[PDB]
């Protein structure tokens, strides 16, 4: 009311919304015309549209393999390897692509496993993912809604809003230095 209306930062990309100086910041974060960053877990700093995400991964990250199936096994090899490492692969099911990431971070080591949907924030609400570590007379399960690549996983990992475990847990489910994470994607 009576306040001057400013166009969105991504008005050049197709945003037809004009908001005042205060409300401007809150929308630009949740804006659909905001460029998508590279979903790969700091080496790559690429940005572009959502339609350019799958070709970018096919060309600049050829080493990432894609498995067909809603229920697969993510066998991350050399989990005891010295230093902080990352494991990434893709899951093709329900006509969509999902990024499966296992992040090893230096602890005062800790592990973070999460699933992202290559799609919008609204598209991610229609899915659910399950992560499970299985052993003899042991099972650790994590279930949640997959994050959209638009918002990423940086905030989610920092809030531990994913499957979180340490070196002690990892050795209980590790077979010949490899950890097998059962990944199940479902439509809700």
């Amino acid at each position: 009311a009576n306040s001057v209306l400013f166009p969105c930062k991504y008005a050049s990309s197709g945003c037809e919304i004009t908001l005042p100086h205060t409300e401007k910041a809150d929308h630009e974060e949740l804006c659909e015309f905001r460029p998508y960053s590279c979903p790969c877990p700091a080496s790559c700093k690429w940005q572009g549209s959502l339609d350019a995400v799958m070709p970018h991964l096919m060309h600049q990250h050829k080493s990432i393999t894609t498995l067909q199936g809603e229920d697969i096994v993510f066998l991350a090899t050399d989990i005891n390897l010295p230093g902080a490492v990352d494991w990434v692969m893709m899951q093709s099911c329900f006509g969509f692509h999902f990024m499966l990431v296992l992040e090893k971070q230096e602890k005062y080591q800790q592990f973070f496993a999460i699933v992202q949907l290559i799609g919008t924030r609204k598209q991610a609400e229609n899915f659910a993912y399950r992560l499970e570590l299985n052993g003899h007379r042991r099972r650790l399960t994590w279930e949640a809604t997959p994050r959209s690549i638009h918002e990423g996983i940086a905030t989610a990992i920092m809030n531990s809003d994913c499957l979180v475990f340490d070196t002690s847990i990892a050795q209980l489910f590790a077979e010949n230095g490899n950890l097998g994470i059962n990944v199940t994607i479902s439509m809700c």
């Binding site: 790969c40 877990p41 080493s63 393999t65 498995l67 067909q68 199936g69 229920d71 697969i72 096994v73 993510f74 066998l75 991350a76 090899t77 050399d78 390897l81 490492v85 990352d86 494991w87 990434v88 692969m89 296992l102 490899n178 097998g180 059962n182």
Partner: peptide
């Protein structure tokens, strides 16, 4: 008989 992928650590 779920498909398994041996994922090596990222280079």
């Amino acid at each position: 008989p779920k498909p398994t992928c041996m994922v090596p650590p990222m280079p």
